[model samples]
Target: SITAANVEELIAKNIAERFADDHEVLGLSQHFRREGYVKLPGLVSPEVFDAVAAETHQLIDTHQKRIDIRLKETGDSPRYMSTVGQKAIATDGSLIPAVYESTALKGFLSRLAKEEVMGCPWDEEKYIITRQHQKGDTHGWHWGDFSFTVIWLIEAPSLEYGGMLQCIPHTDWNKDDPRVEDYLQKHPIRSYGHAKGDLYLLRSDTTLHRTVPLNADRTRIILNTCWASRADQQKATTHETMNAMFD
Candidate 1:
């Protein structure tokens, strides 16, 4: 049975099987340091992903909020997306929360980061489920408060239909008056497209990233799990955008 008690265990088993080799972890760590992103093609088996997706879809139905505003903090980036925030997910007794609290998941993330990965101290910004289902819906350009994030895909559209990820790693975030144009002119942005059941990690705080707006009414859903590096835990952060979206 895929009960809450065993959900994380099942996920751990799959991760162990996929990433059993020390060399794979070392290679991924190098890739992560260079690009600030790496995709795990099969982090979880289809059966486990199905369970997580089924529970997550229901959570979205209950607590999802539409975000359709330009976040001035991140250089007036448009946020035409839907999300279920951390508090709601915490209250729900399901697989989503289990994934967040999974020790094995944290260990795997630490291996990829080449550093100890800690939980987000900010309770409300720990985890979120974001979805883009309508034409032009997007989670626009922004940096996260935490150091790292692992996004588990529930549904993803093709690159042609949009909903692809674009990022400029090693960038800075100026909350008072972020200038997106400056970053665009300064660095080369990396673009990637993912499929359902895929998982990807990102250096969230230093990576200026966003999801491309959907060209059609195609669905793209992701569970974003945030984590902190040792340095990140000590850094002061703001919550203006998070408050606007979740509070």
Candidate 2:
């Protein structure tokens, strides 16, 4: 437990160090405004990333559940991955919860978003660790309940083997009956591929997004931390899909 807490401190220090310069933050803010997301390269040292990766692996091995169901709320999108939800990690003495709640981390994200960023209110849906290991394993198309998400890649597969991100920005979610197919036909979906240890942010709520299915046996493991926008804190967000899968 102390070791995990130390790891959390290390991550906070890393975030502070990487974003210490105002000019760098301003430049990144501009990029974030244009792209709706920003890749944060070398936010953590190689050794720190390795330590986080090891913690993730141990947590997943102990708490992961195989989820292979389609969620009705998100238009029956396929969710085929091994996942460990926030509920498990919060009490597991892991590095995730503290890292997710780090003040410096939230400040960094808030600056990038050009608005206030709050911790997601729901404990069960706040953060997750997921792995896509088998062929056809995917975290399919859907909009996040919250506004922002920062994903840390513990392991990334080759682009040829799939597991890249695809997003249709400036889209809205119709929760009762999501017209995912209609959106797919009408909108331009942007795709992104990253290497292991990459960290990136997403404007998730207005972005219809997914991870393309793995085409081979290569694995992709990631830690996702969700944050709420100013408007998000004003609304009552439902978590039907998250409840069904992660809860």
Candidate 3:
């Protein structure tokens, strides 16, 4: 009898208990804070991933959209992206409910972020789950609406022609500082690290990140979950953020 009201708390506690020793959580938090990202390969269980993957394919049979990625400014370094994908809609069933009910997942995120973290579910349908199939697929240059984003790659990505992940860590375009611009100009965006579980984590609003585009034709399925520092920010989105993502 897990009611919606106390469920998140219960899950959080259960998740925290999995570590047994506090050192693990502390170490994770320390590392994640010091570095901007972490990829835990083989961390995703087969059962969970299989279930989600099946659902992704099932949903694909329903509806999807094709988006052409264009630069906010034409001469931008990253340039543009193009993709055919689906934005999970209300009628589309989600594996996120299963993710949301996990105490261990929530607890791990809390410790890693050094704050209380709440996952957005309703918003998952509105803002999460984008699956790509084709060449020239680019999920280019955009900031997340939430504080931190956890991406689960249900499908493996290209290892050649630089079809890897890229990001400008802690970018600030609105701080009235030209340094952010200078940094972007001086250095190329770096590739993200991953291997263990095909999962990735990044600072939500701080980084400007994107996929480098598929050099070969392939199916790329990515599931997104947002962790908010505040309970209020959970499942929240702005008109602009929502508009940035089209369903």
Best by lDDT: 1
TM-score of 3: 0.73
- State every prediction's TM-score relative to the real structure: 0.95, 0.91, 0.73
Among the numbered candidates, top TM-score falls to: 1
Candidate 3 lDDT over residue span 1-247, tens digit each: 3333544554455454545567865776665564456664433454455565566566555655555544343123232232212344335664545565566676677777878777553354223556556677667556655666778776655466344777776663332222445656865677774432377677756676677777777667666666666743643444433443455
Residue pairs with backbone atoms closer than 3 Å in model 3 (clashes): 11-103, 15-103, 15-104, 40-197, 41-195, 41-196, 41-197, 42-196, 42-197
Write candidate 2's Cα lDDT for 1-247 as tens digits.
3355576567677777777899998998887676566788876667677776888898888999999999888998999999988888787845667667777778778888889889887777788889999999999999998888988899988899998898887788889878999988997777889899898888888888899999999899999889898788778878788877774
Cα RMSD (Å) per model? 1.3, 2.1, 5.1
Off by over 4 Å in 3: 1-24, 42-44, 71-90, 120-127, 173-181, 186-188, 193-197, 231-237
Off by over 4 Å in 2: 1-9, 20-24
- Model 2 lDDT, residue 218, Cα: 87
List the candidates ranked by TM-score, beginning with the highest.
Answer: 1, 2, 3
Model 1 scores a TM of: 0.95
